[PDB]
Design a protein around this ligand. Structure first.
Ligand SMILES: [Cl-]
Ligand SMILES: [Cl-]
Ligand SMILES: [Cl-]
Ligand SMILES: [Cl-]
Ligand SMILES: [Mg+2]
Ligand SMILES: [Mg+2]
Ligand SMILES: [Mg+2]
Ligand SMILES: [Mg+2]
Ligand SMILES: [Mg+2]
Ligand SMILES: [Mg+2]
Ligand SMILES: [Mg+2]
Ligand SMILES: [Zn+2]
Ligand SMILES: [Zn+2]
Ligand SMILES: [Zn+2]
Ligand SMILES: [Zn+2]
Lengths: 82, 81
DNA sequence: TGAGTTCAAGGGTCAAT
DNA sequence: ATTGACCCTTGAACTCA
């Protein structure tokens, strides 16, 4: 299940790739929501916040940049289903 | 549709492992986040119900713990907004 | 495997105190 | 300062091809 994979973004356990990157269900859901709602975030610190399991929700801006930096593809996010 | 296990007020679901109201939830969260220590004015046996719950923070906290609330379920503070 | 989904239980806000 | 009614986000667990 979540045996041989680690989230490239936050280090949490991973069941496989999502949007092109080995990632956890947290980072997958976060990236999907960000892309679908076309959200913009702001870092109130130095735009280099630590992204690990405990801290990944502290700064949405930095979490999102890391999703991109590790390879997440926005084009892989499909349209909501009606 | 439950009742808060701490003060007997009306519950909005489980919070930090226990059925509890928005009051007791926010109280526990704040206590844990700021790592506050309270002191009881009397015998550490203060009644904790809907109307008295704010009269002794020490006793309110000890009842939170005694009913099962988990410090570890309180997360790191998130950014302002 | 990797798209999709849901909603309980995390979060924050801010008028009232 | 703290409280709590009210609203927003997260992510474990599930379906579908
Ligand atoms: Cl990867
Ligand atoms: Cl005190
Ligand atoms: Cl008090
Ligand atoms: Cl959460
Ligand atoms: Mg996790
Ligand atoms: Mg996968
Ligand atoms: Mg996760
Ligand atoms: Mg990328
Ligand atoms: Mg909760
Ligand atoms: Mg409270
Ligand atoms: Mg949201
Ligand atoms: Zn992750
Ligand atoms: Zn940041
Ligand atoms: Zn309560
Ligand atoms: Zn007391």
């Amino acid at each position: 299940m979540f045996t041989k994979h680690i989230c490239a973004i936050c280090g949490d356990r991973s069941s496989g790739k999502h949007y092109g990157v080995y990632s956890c269900e947290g980072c997958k859901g976060f990236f999907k929501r960000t892309v679908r709602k076309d959200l913009t975030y702001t870092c109130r610190d130095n735009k280099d916040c630590l992204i690990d399991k405990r801290q990944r929700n502290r700064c949405q801006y930095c979490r999102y940049q890391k999703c991109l930096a590790m390879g997440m593809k926005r084009e892989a996010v499909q349209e909501e289903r009606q």
